[PDB]
Amino acid sequence: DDANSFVRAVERACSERGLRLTPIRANVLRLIADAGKPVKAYELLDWVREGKGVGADAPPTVYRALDFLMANGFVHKLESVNAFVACHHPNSAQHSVPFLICDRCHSAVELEDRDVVSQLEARAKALGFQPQAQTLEVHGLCAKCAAA
């Protein structure tokens, strides 16, 4: 229900935004949702292929589906560990620390300064948000994308 909660929020978001979930995009979304942990690009391709030997999606098609999710902010690249993670959503605890994500490149870094976060979360609760129903995200621009 963790994974179903993620799929439902992205489907709801796509409906609202005018985005289209083709079959591969829904397939990839489901595999990422059912992982519940960061995913390597090679694991996603293996999983997509596990269905049919010959009738499998070509790798570029699989990775364009992953880029679609990243570009729309449903998935980030945790470059810490060279893997892909679902956006924060109304999910469980025990792996929830805010993400800092770049607008252009969709890499994420985890904000691990407990008192900066705690202050940020306090400000947001006072201002009408629920930092514990959904872990916050900070969105900005990385130094590397800023250089161009």
Residue 90 sits in the site that holds a copy of itself (CB under 8 A)? yes
Identify which of 138, 101, 133, 102 has the alpha carbon closest to the alpha carbon of residue 117.
138
Q: Do residues 42 and 84 make contact, with C-beta atoms less than 8 angstroms apart?
A: no
Answer yes or no whether residue 23 interacts with a copy of itself by CB under 8 A: no
Q: Which is nearer to Zn ion, 39 or 101 (CB)?
A: 101
2 binds a copy of itself (CB under 8 A): no
Residues between 107 and 146 that touch a copy of itself (CB under 8 A) = 109, 111, 113, 115-116, 119-120, 123-124, 127-131, 133-144, 146
Task: Report the C-alpha gap between 84 and 93 in whole angstroms.
Answer: 18
Contact 98, 137 (CB under 8 A): yes
Tell me which of a copy of itself, Zn ion, none is bound by residue 72, counting a contact when its beta carbon lies within the kind-specific cut-off of 5 to 8 angstroms: a copy of itself
Is 58 near a copy of itself (CB under 8 A)?
no
Q: Does 18 bind a copy of itself (CB under 8 A)?
A: yes
Sequence-distant (≥ 6) Cβ neighbours of residue 59 within 8 angstroms: 45
Is residue 137 within 8 A of residue 101, CB to CB? The reply is yes
Give the Å distances, CA to CA, from 34 to 11, 57, 112, 142. Answer: 15, 19, 25, 29
Task: Select from Zn ion, a copy of itself, none the partner in contact with residue 2, using the beta carbon and a kind-dependent cut-off of 5 to 8 Å.
Answer: none
Interface with Zn ion, residue 104, by CB under 5 A = yes
Contact of residue 67 among a copy of itself, Zn ion, none (CB under 5-8 Å per partner type) = a copy of itself
| 5 near a copy of itself (CB under 8 A) | no
Q: Which is nearer to Zn ion, 54 or 133 (CB)?
A: 133
Residue 108 is a binding residue for Zn ion (CB under 5 A): no
Retrieve residue 4's tokens. Answer: 């179903």
Backbone angles phi, psi at 78, to 5 degrees: -75, 95
